[PDB]
């Protein structure tokens, strides 16, 4: 239930808002996965 | 055999080879789609490795995965309507392709 | 004369099919696609029936089934056994509705 | 028609082999040798497959096996049953890796 | 028979004798390599003297030493891959040459 899913179809505003929160969470998860801090 | 005949024969041969190549690409895409569907929606017991160990042909593996996906997703009423029969054991073919397209639609709307 | 008897049997069968389709279409789609007004607009009986069937598909059958089972998004030229499958799926949809 | 059926069987066999080779090559060698980009660069399907096989040999099979079993250090022209043996040895190497 | 035919016949004969001499040198090198391999990596019981006392032909001695070296160095999976079979008792030949080349590679990487 995230906006990144093409198949996702929000039935109402509340589901849309929940998808927004899920999308933000998946993005920060993805950001930390891709993050590689420079040592030294 | 004149020059026009030579040219048309060459063009026909080239088009035939291109069509064969496109058919090979289509078969590769079909195999990839079957593998993805089996991995995503079907149990590990239906894997190509174990099926080959049990001694089933590749086409048999594809049609078995298709039939299992149709039974899992497409409702029995839809099966009895499109395929005109409840049993799918002898419906491999274009009707099976239509059924698996319906199953893909079903999983897309389920997601 | 039995050949004509069987022809009349087929005539009755298709007449019953047409009557059922019209009766359900009047209560499902609209009054604008009524047989009388379509005839006034100048469409043959078979054209009226196929147009009503296509509207039934466009109302009940979702677009994904149209572009997957029937291989084309547009029902404008799909008529035939594919159209029969589409109207059967529409009947299933209205039954479950 | 059974001759064409067996031809289709062989077609499916080589298609499965090609799919397996491509799937393992994508995760083993690089994305630069993808089928789409190679086709854009203008290589036939068989040329793409043999190039991928040779890259697999150059990645897994050590050079000594190439210059001893295949009798030549360069895999540029060794294609055939020797190439089949080389890709089998590469499969063994990736299995033990 | 003209002068050109005489010259080409003479050249063909000379090249044939040279090729025979090269073949003799190759056989001598093969015998030396087999002797070195048997002395270095295989037990004294497989010596040419004791094998000849037991009554085995020279080619049999060479292929036996090769098979023992392949079993000792080349892994069973590599044998089953290259030779398509586990048993080596009927694989003497070019496949045996490939196997002993693989065994030489194996001992080189072992050292």
TrEMBL record, chain A:
Domain of life: Bacteria
Protein name (record): Uncharacterized protein
Organism annotation: Borreliella burgdorferi (strain ATCC 35210 / DSM 4680 / CIP 102532 / B31) (Borrelia burgdorferi)
Part of the full-length chain shown: 187 to 226 of 230
């Amino acid at each position: 239930a995230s906006l990144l899913d093409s198949n996702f179809v929000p039935i109402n505003f509340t589901e849309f808002v929940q998808a927004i929160s899920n999308t933000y969470k998946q993005r920060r998860i993805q950001f930390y996965e891709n993050l590689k801090r420079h040592k030294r | 055999l004149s020059i026009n005949e030579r040219i048309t024969k060459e063009l026909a041969e080239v088009e035939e080879r291109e069509r064969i190549e496109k058919q090979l690409l289509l078969e590769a895409e079909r195999i990839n789609e079957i593998d993805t569907l089996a991995k995503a929606h079907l149990s590990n017991h239906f894997n190509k490795e174990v099926l080959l160990a049990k001694g089933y042909t590749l086409k048999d593996i594809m049609q078995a995965q298709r039939r299992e996906l149709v039974r899992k997703f497409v409702p029995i009423e839809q099966i009895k309507a499109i395929a005109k029969v409840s049993d799918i054991s002898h419906i491999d073919g274009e009707i099976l392709e239509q059924l698996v397209s319906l199953a893909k639609v079903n999983i897309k709307l389920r997601k």
